């Protein structure tokens, strides 16, 4: 009920004598929490693929097994306004939080009306024989307009597409053949004709063509989700750096609690953390700043209640040992702790209740009783 009551249910008595009695231990509780983590997103095969001259062809779509990188898909969003950002299987808002096993970049340039044809479960003339997606394709298709880099005048005939396949196309199958194919009952081996033609046709990329015939660059990232150790995880997050406050820090993996301050220490260009004589972490480097921080133990201390005796009165005072009166009525800082509940008199008397380091308290009549 009171500090005197706290002394009552501690000494197992209802008549507390005159003196000082330690009851509890004041400990500052950590309010916030820092998850500042080093080893963050870095160079990755993600770039250099979305910005180039020519990616690949329709029948000659390339492949890049991106691995050994901290997959951070945030760079993909900060780009030119796309034409189609559809994701099949994977939620677009959790790309930076899912550990993927492998990702294969397959880029190809098609016309305008061919953007909606390339999709898992949709057939046609370009998504049926050139590049077909399976029924369990867990990836994202990214398309955008490219009417400035692949729009050469008079018709850019560099892009070809395969047609008239002997059989259906299989998921992720490469078709780079150029043999002469015929409809039937017509001998055609190396020469062309009316019913015989090469299995490749040029693409008309001219500014005179309206919507549906412009070149559009499409790249599909096949995110393979398995149970094996993943190689491309999401980027780890890191909060701000708040100092002069006992919080929970996670610098470089050594999670701990305490007040983060700034010291005058000069670490070596290779040593990151450091201990003291008692082998306890006392100073660490900033992960993303290499700043010499100084971690100090969270403010604690013992609580002592000064009771002049229940028979005399009931007014008591508390003494927070080892407290600068900052970590939580008269308040006076002493050499032993923060004394809350009494005022410092400039007089001098006999030591009735020993407080510490010369300080002494007593129940004396002021003019009042305190």
């Amino acid at each position, epitope marked *: 009920l009171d500090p005197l009551s706290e002394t009552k249910c501690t000494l197992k008595s209802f008549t507390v004598e005159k003196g000082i009695y330690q009851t509890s231990n004041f400990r500052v509780q950590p309010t916030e929490s820092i998850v500042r983590f080093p080893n963050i997103t870095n160079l990755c095969p993600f770039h250099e693929v979305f910005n180039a001259t020519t990616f690949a062809s329709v029948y000659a779509w390339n492949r890049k097994r991106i691995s050994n990188c901290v997959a951070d898909y*945030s760079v993909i*969003y*900060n780009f030119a306004p796309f034409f189609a*950002f*559809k*994701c*099949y*299987g*994977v*939620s*677009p*808002t*959790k790309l*930076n939080d*899912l*550990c993927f096993t492998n990702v294969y970049a397959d880029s190809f340039v098609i016309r305008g009306n061919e953007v909606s044809q390339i999709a*898992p*479960g949709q057939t046609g003339n370009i998504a049926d024989y050139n590049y077909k997606l399976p*029924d*369990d394709f867990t990836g994202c298709v990214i398309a955008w307009n490219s009417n400035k880099l692949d729009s050469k005048p008079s018709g850019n005939y560099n892009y070809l597409y395969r047609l008239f396949r002997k059989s259906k196309l299989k998921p992720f199958e490469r078709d780079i053949s150029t043999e002469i194919y015929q409809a039937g009952n017509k001998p055609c081996n190396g020469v062309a004709g009316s019913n015989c033609y090469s299995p490749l046709q040029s693409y008309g990329f001219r500014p005179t063509y309206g919507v549906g015939h412009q070149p559009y660059r499409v790249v599909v990232l096949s995110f393979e989700l398995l149970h094996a150790p993943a190689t491309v995880c999401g980027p780890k997050k890191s909060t701000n750096l708040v100092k002069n406050k006992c919080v929970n820090f996670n610098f470089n993996g050594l999670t701990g609690t305490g007040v983060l301050t700034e010291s005058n220490k000069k670490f070596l260009p290779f040593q990151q953390f450091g201990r003291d004589i008692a082998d306890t972490t006392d100073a660490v480097r900033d992960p993303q700043t290499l700043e010499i921080l100084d971690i100090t133990p969270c403010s604690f201390g013992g609580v002592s209640v000064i009771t002049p005796g229940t028979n005399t009165s009931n007014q008591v005072a508390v003494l927070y040992q080892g407290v600068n009166c900052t970590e939580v009525s008269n308040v006076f800082q002493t050499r032993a702790g923060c004394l809350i509940g009494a005022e410092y008199v400039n007089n001098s008397y006999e030591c009735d209740i020993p407080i510490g380091a010369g300080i002494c308290a007593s129940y004396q009549t002021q003019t009042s009783q305190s």
Partner: antibody, heavy 122, light 109 residues
Framework: EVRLVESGGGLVQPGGSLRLSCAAS????????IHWVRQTTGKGLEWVSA???????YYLDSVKGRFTISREDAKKSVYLQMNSLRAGDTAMYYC????????????????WGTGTRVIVSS | DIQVTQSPSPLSASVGDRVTITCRAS??????LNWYHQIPGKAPKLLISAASTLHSGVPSRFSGRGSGTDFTLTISSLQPEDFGTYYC??????????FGQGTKVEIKR
């Protein structure tokens, strides 16, 4: 406990531009995706057009251009600013919070809101 | 795209029956579907997540099934506080998640 106030209001005329809001309280605002579902009287859910944490911004092919999303973690609330609307956008707007498994992509959008009504007439 | 053909609008039912609300997709979306419940005069609520796991707060015998395109909401027991429209969310459709048309359940008399 977990409520999303949508006290934005709307009384603009066809050809104006209003500004709504969707403030949440009861969970982590930064570690959550905020959507914006439309419920027309006599129809179903139209679209979402949500926003992401790392600058992820998505739109619908039939609504892009006349809308823009802006996430502000300062006051723990989002806003929806739109350009001149047509005579087909007079419906009741919501904002749902899309969540999935901690290591999956099974979105379910459990945390809904309250609902803001928008009308454009004289 | 990937559309959903839900049950027809008039679906009569009473207190205690086996109601089957089928949400059939045009493609193979696997097991990516979510059931909702929008009562007249209140924001919708979630009932079934991932088409097979009950998220929370739905103990009124709301079991779900589905394999490929076979989803159906088999309600073995109905309650007077579980009436309204239901919507199916095709998660394996597109980033603009398109919901269903709505299936309302009335009372028989």
């Amino acid at each position: 406990e977990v409520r999303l106030v949508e006290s934005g209001g709307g009384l603009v005329q066809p050809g104006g531009s209003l500004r709504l809001s969707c403030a949440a309280s009861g969970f982590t605002f930064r570690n959550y995706d905020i959507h914006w579902v439309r419920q027309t009287t006599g129809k179903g859910l139209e679209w979402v057009s949500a926003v992401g944490t790392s600058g992820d911004t998505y739109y619908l092919d039939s609504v892009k251009g006349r809308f823009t999303i802006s996430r502000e973690d300062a006051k723990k609330s989002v806003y929806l600013q739109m350009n001149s609307l047509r005579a087909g956008d007079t419906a009741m707007y919501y904002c749902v919070r899309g969540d999935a498994s901690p290591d999956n992509i099974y979105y379910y959008m459990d945390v809904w809101g309250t609902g803001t009504r928008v009308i454009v007439s004289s | 795209d990937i559309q959903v053909t839900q049950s027809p609008s008039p679906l009569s039912a009473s207190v205690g029956d086996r109601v089957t609300i089928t949400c059939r997709a045009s493609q193979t979306i696997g097991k990516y579907l979510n059931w909702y419940h929008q009562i007249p005069g209140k924001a919708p609520k979630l009932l079934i997540s991932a088409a097979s796991t009950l998220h929370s707060g739905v103990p009124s015998r709301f079991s779900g099934r589905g394999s490929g395109t076979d989803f159906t909401l088999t309600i073995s027991s109905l309650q007077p506080e579980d009436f309204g429209t239901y919507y199916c969310q095709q998660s394996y459709s597109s980033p603009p998640w398109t919901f269903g048309q709505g299936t309302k359940v009335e009372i028989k008399r």
